[PDB]
Amino acid sequence: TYCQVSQTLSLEDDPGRTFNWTSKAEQCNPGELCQETVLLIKADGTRTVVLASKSCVSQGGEAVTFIQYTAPPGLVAISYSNYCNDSLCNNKDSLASVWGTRHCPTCVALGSCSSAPSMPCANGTTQCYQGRLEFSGGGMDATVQVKGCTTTIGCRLMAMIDSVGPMTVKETCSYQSF
């Protein structure tokens, strides 16, 4: 009936090393458990967008879920979600265990990219991608603009998955296949 609670959005140089996810505890309503959910999104050569949620929650079992939505080279999207049902269980402190050539405008930002310089695409990329990710729920409401060379096909940076712990995801994009 106590859980760590925090909602953070950040751009992160080296979130594997530096990110401190330890948060203050708060009392849940009865018949609520804890969750810790983080989503990390990166383009080639960019910083990493980090959506990190800790809260009391009423829906769900005690699964631990690790997903790679989209694989390098290029765009990378990865999540860790731990739902757990004893006081202060959502206590992960660190993201260490979690995280004729073509050219594409490349960037990541919360909101809108200030710029999207052109970068050469590695072997294995299928397309240029210009997308927008809409997040809602869990006190985590946000947009992420993502452009770059990617392995994903069409508007599938988030692999057609609608939700990430307490967050809902909508994806819209343009893409230019090779």
Ligand SMILES: *[C@@H]1O[C@H](CO[C@@H]2O[C@@H](C)[C@@H](O)[C@@H](O)[C@@H]2O)[C@@H](O[C@@H]2O[C@H](CO)[C@@H](O)[C@H](O)[C@H]2NC(C)=O)[C@H](O)[C@H]1NC(C)=O
């Ligand atoms: C989350 O835990 C609650 C609390 O359960 C109690 O404490 C646990 C550590 C364990 O020892 C349980 O046996 C205890 O009951 C769960 O609530 C209970 O669930 C049972 C079975 O559905 C039900 O008949 C009891 O009356 C429930 N008690 C309350 C307070 O509602 C809850 O279901 C757990 N949820 C998950 C997803 O694990």
Ligand SMILES: *[C@@H]1O[C@H](CO[C@@H]2O[C@@H](C)[C@@H](O)[C@@H](O)[C@@H]2O)[C@@H](O)[C@H](O)[C@H]1NC(C)=O
């Ligand atoms: C991470 O931070 C911990 C203490 O944090 C402080 O407590 C939390 C609840 C935050 O609200 C923060 O703003 C406070 O200053 C440290 O005890 C812990 O050791 C830190 N981890 C590392 C690896 O440095």
